[PDB]
Amino acid sequence: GIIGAGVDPLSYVPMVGVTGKGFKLINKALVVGAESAALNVASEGLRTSVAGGDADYAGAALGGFVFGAGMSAISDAVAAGLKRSKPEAEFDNEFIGPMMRLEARETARNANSADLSRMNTENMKFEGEHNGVPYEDLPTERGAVVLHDGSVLSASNPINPKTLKEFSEVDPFGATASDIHERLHGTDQRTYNDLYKAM
């Protein structure tokens, strides 16, 4: 319960010691059907090939969750800081949406089911469509897109294809040669990743 609990944390200890470590957010509640096992031999957990892949992620999350809940609390605080002038304008404001739909996704990742962060469903999947994926705009918080699942992508994200279009929009026998290029660009990316880890 990082949000649902949920704290601020705006007045918290400097939090020096923590790194990771034992942070898996199985929010009690927000878990619905808890199929313990697996859907395939894929799934599993973060399907990664570096050691530390389950701790880099964890670190990011503690740092993402704390920061997101804090942005939510501080936007609630500045809301009241503006209520003293006028009682209400619209004030939405804020990231409660993205942070809650991220906490639910994390719980579904750690608890192996119950994707309760899925908007649903209809329609239709027009207009799209930057690359293959068709999206749909939800009349709600600015942006955003909804997928075919549809796992919703908050606006101001690097993925949501509406924003990607908007940015690419107005702003400042033996064979072959191409097979060689793809083999090489697929192995050299891997060795770049292995070099980045060691660096």
Q: Which one, 43 or 83, has the nearer CB to a copy of itself?
A: 43
- DSSP three-state, residue 163: helix
Does position 79 bind a copy of itself by CB under 8 A? Answer: no
Q: How far is the CB of 19 from a copy of itself (least distance, A)?
A: 15
Using the rule CB under 8 A, is 116 a contact of a copy of itself?
yes
The site map against a copy of itself for 127-156 (x = CB under 8 A) is ---xxxxx------------xxxxx-xx-x
Query: What six digits make up the tokens of 89?
Result: 């304008």
- Which of 3, 30, 100, 105 is in the footprint of a copy of itself by CB under 8 A? 105
DSSP 151: B
Q: What dihedral angle (degrees, nearest 10) is formed by the CA atoms of 157, 158, 160, 164?
A: 130
60 near a copy of itself, judged by CB under 8 A: yes
Integer Cα distance of 39 and 104 in angstroms? 19
Position among 4, 12, 45, 83 found at the interface with a copy of itself (CB under 8 A): 45
Judged by CB under 8 A, does residue 11 bind a copy of itself? Answer: no
Which residues inside 161-190 make contact with a copy of itself, applying CB under 8 A?
A: 161, 164, 168, 173-179, 181
What would the DSSP string read from start to end of 77-93? HHHHHHHTT-S-S----
Give which of 120, 115, 5 is closest to 65, Cα–Cα: 5
Residue 2: how many other CB atoms lie within 10 Å: 23
Please tell me whether residue 36 binds a copy of itself under the rule CB under 8 A.
Answer: yes
| 105 membership: H or E segment, kind and range | helix 96-111
120 binds a copy of itself (CB under 8 A): yes
